[PDB]
Design a protein around this ligand. Structure first.
Ligand code: NA
Ligand code: NA
Ligand code: NA
Ligand code: NA
Lengths: 468, 469, 465, 468
């Protein structure tokens, strides 16, 4: 059961969020955010720049000073705050899911049942880690007592993409706040709305001023300012091609001949088409064993043709528009390159509507490794199907590219052989895009997400006489 | 490639080991240990009883006193001591492997390449854990610094069986010593020799006096004395349900084994499943806590499986353990010898189809022919009671849902042979056993849980000036 | 800031709780629960016996069956349920603190600010552990993939004492539920009410029927039935958590004012009814006289009276049996030669009130220095050296404390003291995250006792690092 | 008890070590390494450059290929090899200690009892970690079995300094090899000999060819080549994944209630150890005003009695500085101290006409703004500053973060300072106490050292009905 959406949700937040207050850009400039479904402007948004970032960083630094409310607060209480934030987001679940759809373009049913559900689960998961990340007491040689303490890194710069606005924000705030860091976040110009509203909930939840600061704006400006600021202790970027870069692209989905055909077909479809193909780990290279190639391809094309493209607020809609005009044209050019390179266009291939950034679900057959559409990730509804013969062969082709991969088979040995040989951060077996707030995700979440937001301090004390 | 064995190894240790010295029993009494291959006495061994145990526990307690060499020793050094012990055992590998065979009966080739090898790997694995089991610093509410220390439990009474004399000794000494505990060990009357020789190596390795004490003797005497001693902090028993009850009656842990299910699905690799099922049951003369004594086979492959299993059992070479061709030695002693025979009789009486073997394999020693019973039923005695002998039980089943219930209706171990991913995961999750093997059996590895049982957690919570994250 | 209490709270739950439903005993018998402050009956409570426990164990077993809602539920959801139960308890905080005081006797201010606060923290802490207790993937030799899974033990029998009725219930429920077990709980006959009301909240929270079952009654019957039941997987009273004679050591360099107030707290907290009461106060000779004098004055000013009065520091003892037992112990203290410094008798004609009592010049051989009476009776012993106090303190191991300004003395004592918990310059400082034991409770360690480890070892193609 | 050293150790290894073989530089160039005690050339050593580095990376990559002996080897066996290497170093301990002294200058007694002892303990410590670094099985939502594997990162570039040649080599090899990585190591031009001999022991121990490769040479060339190589997966510098391990100006705080005798001796050790060439040297000795005069008087007398001379002499406490460049830099800093107004209490000049010997130097009443109080010189130059309160000292000590120390008998003061000091390691009543088990950073050593040498792979499998 999904509640009826408000197809025209009101925008309450569209400025810079610093010290639990809303500010206009220092330059007073503002940029428009567009509804991808119509191509029309939703509203104006404050355009943050270097000077705005500097204000945010100063606020963050102040909120991180020894003796401050955030620093003195019990670890268990940071957990309480994250749980409270989660409760507030659930309260406004319907409103947030609709706003997400309005600004991003993804189907409202998905925004509500998937995006929001995962946001809630992420924050509540991290709330639980707040007071459970232990240091150690170490049995060092000599008459000493040695132990470690896991301290926060400090001011963390977070730049999040537009594909999953709310979930990306939660993935970043969850682990950072659980460990006691302060944040200066930059949201995507294409999808700044929902994150700004969450900022309002962060204040309502009771987080001290300056703990979380959000600076909407442009990449070359605000984004770069955060990455270059001398008082930022850590910067985590997630998007297109302490510092951590989280990029995604060309994930191989391997279908063995003994795989369940119906399941394989639906999963490979999902693996690529999910969220308009706008996923860092989209299974954009579907490797199919020769014995089942023809049948698999036939079923895949049939599924792609039946995929409903339309108004994201319509319950029947499976695919909304692409995020913006730039991606829209980028995907169209990519489809043309596929045709020019000799890939067999099986269906789709063009615009799906005269209004908005809609593209027909496209499928290319007989794709080769050397082709552009087999090497470049375009984050669009364009499926690439490649044929292969042996398991040894596919391993090499799949690895010749490492965020994620998948293998569909009923054979135990094949599953274990492939899961070990595939060089990817996450390897799915008979499923795809299965993330858990508790399962790590990286390239070549969970408790591992905490390591990156913590600094280790070792204290070694001379004692009278050590005894086991 | 295995060195030529001294079929008649000299015995250097046969007394009570306390404070790195050899002592005769207080009573001066001694018991004989027999070579199961000939039925002849190997030598006399000091018979420890309550008073001997009391001396051992006193020595152990003294070595565990605060400020003692063992207590003050760096954790990394406990690791060095364990590594030195392993080096010495390896130096005397050929000798020990032969002594093990002589006293226990297992094939020398196995004693050398399996038993010793695992003893070495176990001690070396644990040596590495000595300085790596950390306590925690805890983010408690308020202005407090709270942390935990994992201290040793103290005096640990360890009673080990006769099936894997040396390995059981390593499995107990490894985790206990790595964590800084002291030990009072009671070895099996049927196999006391190897453990006593290792005691000599423990002394040579440099372990302080009283850290490890070994009292050979009888179960209801020495064994019960350890379990009932008021100054023993922990007692771990590994063996038959029969003596376990006595110990339970006399921190306590009872490690028993029996009737482990080996499930063969229709899609299993036939050649592999047959050889593995054979190994699963027959390994170590069937004297294994997790012996696959219930081989469930899906109906569509039952006939073929049984045929191949019977052929394999008939070809199993029984004979002198010191002969390189020997696959199966004798049973550990006369009591088990007759107990197994009675069990085979019961199988016949109950309607089980005797497919091969079923009787004595030699006029000298405790050798029994590899026996296989077909069409076994859940209600039969040979399908409910574990006899630790070379007697295989093959049961037929139809569905996977069915076999789960039947396998669980008994939980040390279990195995599944199948090429199907979903079938492997379904069974590994559904089978209620401590260890579930998939397409393999008896695959143990020295490889943290064993450490928890050997440590005490102490929390220290200190008031401090204002706390900050 | 404590809301005014309802000094005579309504009782909504007084029956056996099985499968989210209220049941009368099969015998239909009931027993009275008394208000220790007046000696009068509060209400009748269903007297569960063996047959009632049997119904509870079966309901638990059913709830634990593979494929059941509690077994199939995502680990994260068990956490959501724990968090919802905490929210409900917080909603009914004022009411529950009053009921706890009515039935147990402790001051309402403490019930509210201490017991209820700790209950909330305990449940919320454990809610966080539900989906974070990982198994391991092990690098075994050979071409094998080996891993472990932490499964619930099953039906857990839990016997809760009367000293901290609500807190002990939370300490037992938190880890057990976070790990997916089912429970059959036996509450103390002296204090059954608060736990039964929490059962109602357990049902309201959404826990499946049979996950938590509560059987009020007596120890020799209901308690023994749980302990002997063949279908109960684990019983926690096998693990026995007992407490007694915890040493509180005051070094000559301690902060005098702080040590005096803390030693007073250490012993008198909860009418001295605490498993780790600092009932042996060891004081170094150079400060003994002054420490004793200040301790005596503090004991004399301790306000004893109606626990609902804001000024009350000490309520009555839990029941008449304890009341008499403590009085007999005070008499033995005088007979054996301990110096009675203050108190020593009954504090009121109604209720089980005892005057705060302090004994000086206590010797290790005395009965009052060896037997724990769980009462408002302080023992002050004198010592000379740090080496001496260690031996005396250890000659008894749930807890201990040291008061000193010296780093080395503090580290030497915290290591040498054979106690499960050692406090330095504080006392009774518990955290839902810090372990406690003489098995272990609280923290991550509390999860170990409620889990079975299953190893799965799979043969795989060709293993690579 | 230390054996008699060979004051003229023979050199057996002086080339590039690749695939368990000794190679001359492609250019055939060599550079002389000097004995800092005499200023004379010990021998010539192959001068590796980009081309030699490329060969080592290729050998390392090959040894890391799936299916190779190093990749297939049981984890426990990597541990056996590390223990064998340790046994071989122990066999050649007397020789190694003398060669360390000949090339670096530190007292032979220290090389034998300290450096070599720590090298042995470090390798033996990591040998034990080889098969104990577990992944996890995660309780994810839904009918899925999710687990992680900790895989090696791959080709690790390791650049080690000259202050502790052998120990630094072991700190890098231990964790890298225990977790199955392969190495391309660049040793310091000032001290390449001991590491090259160890490579010979690595071969003798049985490590597969290409697992460890060592390229002696210069920083701007060989080092830069490793850091910039496209096929190097991680680079660790001490002096792709990158980690810079730098050190400097660690504060040693002496409270008025400290044990005077122990504090004076430890402060002396804290600064003067290893000719002052230690990243965490206690180069800022803060002394509480009530004990200042006496502490200084004692420190001066202790510095004046410190024996400087031939490092092979058993009475020698201080050998020469590592090279001419450091010698001059220290003389420059001493002059800077005098010109700045710091009170020169003793030393301050050249201690011998041959070699690079400097007199133990003590500056008194140093103030925070002085250059000698802000820059690290890695020399036998002690700075003593005066302070009044604990709140004051915290701020002064922090205004600079690898290490710090506090000497006091008071529990609260020790906890206050160990909490407040922003340093990776805080020692209480001791200094320079390292354990192979305790982490060190500004991480290395302990369990923490393994995290940087491993990649986390998550495998998530769809399974029939899941149950707890
Ligand atoms: Na938009
Ligand atoms: Na024998
Ligand atoms: Na009552
Ligand atoms: Na040199």
């Amino acid at each position: 059961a999904v509640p009826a959406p408000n197809q025209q949700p009101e925008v309450f937040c569209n400025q810079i969020f610093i010290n639990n207050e809303w500010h206009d850009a220092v330059s007073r400039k503002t940029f428009p955010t567009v509804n991808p479904s119509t191509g029309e402007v939703i509203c104006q948004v404050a355009e943050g720049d270097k000077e705005d970032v500097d204000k945010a960083v100063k606020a963050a630094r102040a909120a991180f000073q020894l003796g401050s409310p955030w620093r003195r607060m019990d670890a268990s209480h940071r957990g309480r705050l994250l749980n409270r934030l989660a409760d507030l987001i659930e309260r406004d679940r319907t409103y947030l899911a609709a706003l997400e759809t309005l600004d991003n373009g993804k189907p409202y049913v998905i925004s509500y049942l998937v995006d929001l559900d995962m946001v809630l689960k992420c924050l509540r998961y991290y709330a639980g880690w707040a007071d459970k990340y232990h240091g150690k007491t170490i049995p060092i040689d000599g008459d000493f007592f040695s132990y470690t303490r896991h301290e926060p890194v400090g001011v963390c710069g977070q730049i999040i993409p537009w594909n999953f606005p709310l979930l990306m924000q939660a993935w970043k705030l969850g682990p950072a706040l659980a460990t006691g860091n302060v944040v200066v976040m930059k949201v995507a110009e294409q999808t700044p709305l929902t994150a700004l509203y969450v900022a309002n909930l962060i204040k309502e939840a009771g987080f001290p001023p300056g703990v979380v600061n959000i600076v909407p704006g442009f990449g070359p400006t605000a984004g770069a300012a955060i990455a270059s600021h001398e008082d930022v202790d850590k910067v985590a970027f997630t998007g297109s091609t302490r510092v951590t870069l989280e990029l995604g692209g060309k994930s191989p989905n391997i279908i063995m001949s003994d795989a369940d055909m119906d399941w394989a077909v639906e999963q490979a479809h999902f693996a690529l088409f999910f969220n308009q193909g706008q996923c860092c780990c989209a299974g954009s290279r579907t490797f199919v064993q020769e014995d089942i190639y023809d049948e698999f391809v036939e079923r895949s094309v049939a599924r792609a043709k039946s995929r409903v493209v339309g108004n994201p607020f319509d319950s029947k809609t499976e695919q909304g528009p692409q995020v913006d005009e730039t991606q829209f044209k980028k995907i169209l050019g990519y489809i043309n390159t596929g045709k020019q390179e000799g890939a067999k266009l099986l269906c789709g291939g063009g615009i799906a509507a005269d209004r908005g950034y809609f593209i027909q679900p496209t499928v290319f057959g007989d794709v080769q490794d050397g082709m552009t559409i087999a090497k470049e990730e375009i984050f669009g509804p364009v499926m690439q199907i490649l044929k292969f013969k042996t398991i040894e062969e596919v391993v090499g082709r799949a690895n010749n590219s490492g965020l994620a991969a998948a293998v569909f088979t009923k054979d135990l040995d094949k599953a274990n052989y492939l899961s070990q040989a595939l060089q990817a951060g996450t390897v799915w077996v008979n499923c795809y895009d299965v993330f858990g707030a508790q399962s790590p995700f990286g390239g070549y979440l969970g408790e591992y997400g905490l390591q990156a937001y913590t600094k280790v301090k070792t204290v070694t004390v001379k004692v009278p006489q050590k005894n086991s």
